[PDB]
Amino acid sequence: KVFGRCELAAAMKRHGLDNYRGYSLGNWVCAAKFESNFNTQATNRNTDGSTDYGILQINSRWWCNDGRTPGSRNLCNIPCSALLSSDITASVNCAKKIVSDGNGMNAWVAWRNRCKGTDVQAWIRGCRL
Ligand SMILES: [Cl-]
Ligand SMILES: [Cl-]
Ligand code: NA
Ligand code: NA
């Protein structure tokens, strides 16, 4: 599923991400835009052989099991394919674990480089929330 901007904002709000660990909703929408272009089916392979999955591009070296990343942890205890569903619950629950691990949203390179320090409220402007 490719989400609309306000549709995703609403879904993320219902799943408890607005101000989760102090990150306002616009941060999460901005991160999803530049990680996946709002596409739950997005996958990208990394140089080290791991792969990133879903709307928030969660990596198989640490967070999910894809059967082909040797020596990986499955810290979210989920198959990586569950992160590609039109239902974002599994991606959101895992992202909550990631953002709580010490480095905040800096775990997402695209957030650090394209969202951090910008007017992220613009990503939810105009939405009925
Ligand atoms: Cl915001
Ligand atoms: Cl980047
Ligand atoms: Na929308
Ligand atoms: Na893994």
Q: Where are the alpha helices (DSSP H) in the chain?
A: 5-14, 25-36, 89-99, 109-114
Header resolution in angstroms: 1.7
- Give the whole-angstrom CA distance, residue 29 versus residue 26: 5
CA–centroid distance, residue 97 to ligand 1 (Å): 20
The answer to whether the beta carbons of residues 69 and 60 sit under 8 Å apart is: yes
The answer to whether the beta carbons of residues 65 and 80 sit under 8 Å apart is: yes
Range of the domain at 94: 1-129
Phi, psi of 25 (to 5 degrees): -55, -40
Torsion of CA 79, 81, 84, 85, to 10 degrees: -80
List, in sequence order, every residue forming a beta bridge with 52; answer none if it has no partner.
Answer: 44, 59
Ligand with the closest atom to the CA of 113: 2
The answer to whether the beta carbons of residues 31 and 115 sit under 8 Å apart is: yes
Q: How many domains does the chain have?
A: 1
Task: Starting at the earlier edge strand, list the strands of the sheet with 58-59.
Answer: 43-45, 51-53, 58-59
Q: Which experimental technique did the depositors report for determining this structure?
A: X-ray
Q: Which of 35, 48, 66, 87 is catalytic?
A: 35
Question: Can you give the length of the chain in residues?
Answer: 129
Q: Which of 48, 52, 87, 119 is catalytic?
A: 52
| Amino acid occupying residue 95 | A
Q: Quick one: CA dihedral 91, 96, 102, 103, positive or negative?
A: positive
Quote the tokens at residue 77.
């205890």
Q: Which residue has the tokens 């709307």?
A: 55
- Give the whole-angstrom CA distance, residue 14 versus residue 16: 6
- Give the whole-angstrom CA distance, residue 99 versus residue 93: 10
Q: What is the CATH number of the domain that holds 26?
A: 1.10.530.10
| Amino acid occupying residue 51 | T
